[PDB]
Structures are given as structure tokens and as C-alpha cells.
């Protein structure tokens, strides 16, 4: 641990405070994740290390080392330049070019596809969990709420995902999580890149739900079999009509809208998988454009 000189703080997140740091000996620039150490090693950290050690992929941030000492636990990570959320904010006026959106989504979908076919659920995909570099790459990060689904994963009664990017199944109280929840998140982010505004920005749990209903139409038995039997469904739910996608995501072409509705499909059983999404007509001309990063 005496090898690394701490350079600066770069934000807190789930497990704990994160620093940019340099390897005094190799020169390699890393991201240090510090943990103070008394209920033992934190559940989130045990899960993050354990699962990331397995997930070696270009679009998943690499866990480079784990330093185990007396009173402190450090997780060494590869370093990226900023989060997608901050890049979106810098783009606000100009906008993210459609080719770069396509490139980012393609890459994220590869990362997610890798995660899923290795029985790992991310469960917390949001623009501040996705990391980019100057070379046009994007990678999944913060696996503190990640879970192995060799056996199906039971849902928390008090849910700890972001509200805005939460799938409707979770909000309606279904027993198990699903790969489909991660697809939903990317869908919401995909639309947000396109529109410069968040797709469903809810105040509360019920506000979030209704916002999903106002845009995509209130689900019923024809659309999503078993909807009304779910624990948190209420008969007195307002019945909205589905809205024309060309008024939801205007700058997207037919393919873009085609993929997006499949990513936001109501039934988690019939929602497009990451694997399938990669083969969608939308990515037929995908390239790897370079972003313009500020500061």
C-alpha cells in the first residue's frame, strides 16, 4: 500500500470514498476505493470484489488489485476520465451526437451481456455508474449492489436501486429480480442520451410508476399477464393510453424506436435481452466515435 500516492478525491459511492491515485513505481494511474475497518468486511465489498474478479471484459471496469491489511481495505481499479452523467451535463447545450449514443449503447450492451451470461446482475445502472474515456470507450462500474443469480435473487422490501431507472416489475413488487431489470435501466439511459432529459423522473415510488404508465400506457392482462395479481398493483390504477414514440424520443429513427420499445417492454419475460439487442438492425452501422470531454 506504500506504493500508491493519493492524488485527489473523485467522489463517494456505495462502498465508500474513491480517490485517483498513482503507482510510484510503475507510473500506472489507478482509482483507489478506500474502506474503513466493525461488522467485518462490508457485504457490498465482498460481493463487488468476488464478482468483478470473474468479470474480465473491456466494457466492465477492471478490478486490478485488492490490498488486505490491518485496519484498512483498499480496492485498486483501472482509471477512467469521468462519468456519463457529467458528460451529459457538459453536452446539455450541444447534445451528444447520435453516432456516439449508438456507440455507447452498443458497448454497454456488450458489458451487460457479458455480466448476464456470467450469472451477474448489476441492479444499479445509472449515468453516474457508467464511465467513459477520451478514446470513446464506456464501461460498467460500481458493483456494490451486484448479485450472483445462480439461484434466483429475492427482492428487498426496502429497494435500494435508483428511483428514476427502476423497472416496473420491482415497483409492482414481484418476488425475484431478473436480467430484464438491467435492460430497463439501459433503456431509460438510452432515451435520456437522446432527449437530454430523464425519461421517468419520479418523486416517489407511486409517482415513478405513474410516469411509466403515462408514457407507455397502463399495463393490463393483454400486455403483461399477471399484472393485476402482483402485490403492489391496485385496481384503482388510472388507465392511460400508450404514447406515440415519435413524441417521446423525436430525434430517433425507426430502428432506434424499435429497440427502445423492446428495451422498455412491460413483461420482463418478453423484454429484449442484452444479447438479442446487440443483433438489432439499429447497430448495423455502429462505429466507435471519440467524445469531447471537458475539464
Amino acid at each position: 500500500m506504500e506504493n500508491f500516492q493519493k492524488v485527489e478525491k473523485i467522489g463517494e459511492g456505495t462502498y465508500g470514498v474513491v480517490y485517483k491515485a498513482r503507482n510510484k513505481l510503475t507510473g500506472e494511474v489507478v482509482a483507489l476505493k478506500k474502506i474503513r475497518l466493525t461488522e467485518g468486511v462490508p457485504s457490498t465489498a465482498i460481493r463487488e470484489i468476488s464478482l468483478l474478479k470473474e468479470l474480465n471484459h473491456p466494457n466492465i471496469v477492471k478490478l486490478l488489485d485488492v490490498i488486505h491489511t490491518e485496519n484498512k481495505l483498499y480496492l485498486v481499479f483501472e482509471f477512467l476520465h469521468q462519468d456519463l452523467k457529467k458528460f451529459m451535463d457538459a453536452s446539455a447545450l450541444t447534445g451528444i451526437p447520435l453516432p456516439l449514443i449508438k456507440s455507447y449503447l452498443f458497448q454497454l450492451l456488450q458489458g451487460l451481456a457479458f455480466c448476464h451470461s456470467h450469472r451477474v446482475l448489476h441492479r444499479d445502472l445509472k449515468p453516474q455508474n457508467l464511465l467513459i474515456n477520451t478514446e470513446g470507450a464506456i464501461k460498467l462500474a460500481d458493483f456494490g449492489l451486484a448479485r450472483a443469480f445462480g439461484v434466483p435473487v429475492r427482492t428487498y422490501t426496502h429497494e435500494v436501486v435508483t428511483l428514476w431507472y427502476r423497472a416496473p416489475e420491482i415497483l409492482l413488487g414481484c418476488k425475484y429480480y431478473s436480467t430484464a431489470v438491467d435492460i430497463w435501466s439501459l433503456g431509460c439511459i438510452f432515451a435520456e442520451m437522446v432527449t437530454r432529459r430523464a425519461l421517468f423522473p419520479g418523486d416517489s415510488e407511486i409517482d415513478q410508476l405513474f410516469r411509466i404508465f403515462r408514457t407507455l400506457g397502463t399495463p393490463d392482462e393483454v400486455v403483461w399477464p399477471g399484472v393485476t395479481s402482483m402485490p403492489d398493483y391496485k385496481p384503482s390504477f388510472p388507465k392511460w393510453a400508450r404514447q406515440d414514440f415519435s413524441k417521446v424520443v423525436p430525434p430517433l429513427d425507426e430502428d432506434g424506436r424499435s429497440l427502445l420499445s423492446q428495451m422498455l417492454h412491460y413483461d420482463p419475460n418478453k423484454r429484449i435481452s442484452a444479447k438479442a439487442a446487440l443483433a438489432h438492425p439499429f447497430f448495423q452501422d455502429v462505429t466507435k466515435p471519440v467524445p469531447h470531454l471537458r475539464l
Binding site: 466493525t38 461488522e39 467485518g40 468486511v41 457485504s43 465482498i46 460481493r47 470484489i49 468476488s50 464478482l51 474478479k53 470473474e54 485488492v66 488486505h68 448476464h116 451470461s117 456470467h118 450469472r119 450472483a148 445462480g150 439461484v151 434466483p152 429475492r154 428487498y156 436480467t179 419475460n269 435481452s273 444479447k275 438479442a276
Partner: protein, 257 residues
């Protein structure tokens, strides 16, 4: 839906690596298979006491067997190993894991809180944070997606059998988790519905009914002798109405393979 066939291939590869040394107990000078049985049985009680998932119990054993594969442990400290493994397994698997104070408690205050946490630290070191281990239970739930159609008595029996394999290191270390699961699933499917290891699963796993025989012969033995076995926590567990009282079902006298 789509990731399933990839997950089987990946889990199949991962059980070869996360496998303990077969005859590790003979290299353990102070402990024997007997004492391990007692510990594992105790962990089942611990599991039922705190209503922890069966997967947690499975992991805990995997950790114990791996830790004991490379660390010499005197008998008086075996439980401290077992208690740390459980705590770690709970942390990996349970949504809200039991507090450390709780684990310290159920040891009849044999060890202090400090002792358990320093052990947890050491178990992590020895296993090198590789906790995402593939279990018999993991394979069973994946296999269940091949019933035509699903039967909870079939499931509950397979689970019971697979759980029983955790107690006896002899002979069950000879078999990969996926093989035990194959045996358990066939035996349950045969006792309950009368059916056999399905064609679709032969193609998926590669295991012919023939190949599962050496494992089936052993498992069937444990099932038949289960009422007389020295460790009873599991049979008690599974005579519950939740698990359809399957531990009370009579095993078939011959598997006729």
C-alpha cells in the same frame, strides 16, 4: 431466457476450479470426517434458526472444505472456521445478513467477536476473495427448468438429497456439484413421478444416465440409511410442510439401473 445455456457452461467450468482436495481429511491430523459432519449438521440448525437460504448453507460448506484443503486446523478451532464461513456466506448471499454479534452468540460464547472477525479476514485471504462458488443447489435450480411440468415434491426431494450430501465428506467430495445434482434430480424424479433423467438434460449436461450411476449408487445409500445416520438436522428440516415432508418418503429399494 437467453443467458441460461451460457450460465450452465460457465458454472460447469467454475466448479472444476472451486473444487477442494478430494482426500484432504487424511492430511488433517487433528480432525476427521466425523467432526466435519457434526459441524455441517450444526450449520443446518444455524441455517434453520436464522431462516437463511439453503444456498447460504451450501456456500458455507464449499468455503469450509476449501479452507481446510490448505490450512491445518486443530479441533478446538474447527467451529470458528465454520462460523466464519457461515458469516461470509451470509454476507454474499442473504439480503439482510445476520449481525456478527449473532454469530458470536450461537457458538455458546466459545469465541469472542474479535476472534470471529479475525477468522473471517483469514478465510477471505485463504480463499482469495473467490466466494462466488457454484453449488449443488445452483445446479439443481438450473436443472429444475427441465421438468415437464414442475413438481414441488420432486424439487423438495432433490434439495433434501443434495443437502444430505453436504454432511458426509466420504464419499461426496469425489463428485463435482453438478454430478451430485444430476444424481439427486434423477433420484427425486424417480421416487416421486417414476420418471428418469430427462433427454433434454442429457444433451445439455452431456451426462448419460449411465455416467451418473457411480454417484447414484452412493446417494441412494445415504437416502436409505438416512434415518439411522448420526446427524439428523436435515431430516428434521425436510419433514416440514414447507418442504412437503419429503424426508418421510420411502426410498425405492432398488434404482434398477
Amino acid at each position: 431466457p437467453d443467458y441460461h445455456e451460457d450460465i450452465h457452461t460457465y458454472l460447469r467450468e467454475m466448479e472444476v476450479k472451486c473444487k477442494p482436495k478430494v482426500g484432504y481429511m487424511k492430511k488433517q491430523p487433528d480432525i476427521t470426517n466425523s467432526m466435519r459432519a457434526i459441524l455441517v449438521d450444526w450449520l443446518v440448525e444455524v441455517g434453520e434458526e436464522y431462516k437463511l437460504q439453503n444456498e447460504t448453507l451450501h456456500l458455507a460448506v464449499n468455503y469450509i472444505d476449501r479452507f481446510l484443503s490448505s490450512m491445518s486446523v486443530l479441533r478446538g478451532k474447527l467451529q470458528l472456521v465454520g462460523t466464519a464461513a457461515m458469516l461470509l456466506a451470509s454476507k454474499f448471499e442473504e439480503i439482510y445478513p445476520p449481525e456478527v454479534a449473532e454469530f458470536v452468540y450461537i457458538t455458546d460464547d466459545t469465541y469472542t467477536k474479535k476472534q470471529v472477525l479475525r477468522m473471517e479476514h483469514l478465510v477471505l485471504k485463504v480463499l482469495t476473495f473467490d466466494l462466488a462458488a457454484p453449488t449443488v443447489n445452483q445446479f439443481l435450480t438450473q436443472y429444475f427448468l427441465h421438468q415437464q411440468p414442475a413438481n414441488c415434491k420432486v424439487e423438495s426431494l432433490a434439495m433434501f438429497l443434495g443437502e444430505l450430501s453436504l454432511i458426509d465428506a466420504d464419499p461426496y467430495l469425489k463428485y463435482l456439484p453438478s454430478v451430485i445434482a444430476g444424481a439427486a434430480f434423477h433420484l427425486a424424479l424417480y421416487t416421486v413421478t417414476g420418471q428418469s433423467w430427462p433427454e433434454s438434460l442429457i444433451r445439455k449436461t452431456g451426462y448419460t444416465l449411465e455416467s451418473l450411476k457411480p454417484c447414484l449408487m452412493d446417494l441412494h445409500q445415504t437416502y436409505l440409511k438416512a434415518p439411522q445416520h448420526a446427524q439428523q438436522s436435515i431430516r428434521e428440516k425436510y419433514k416440514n410442510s414447507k418442504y412437503h415432508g419429503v424426508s418421510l418418503l420411502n426410498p425405492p429399494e432398488t434404482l434398477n439401473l
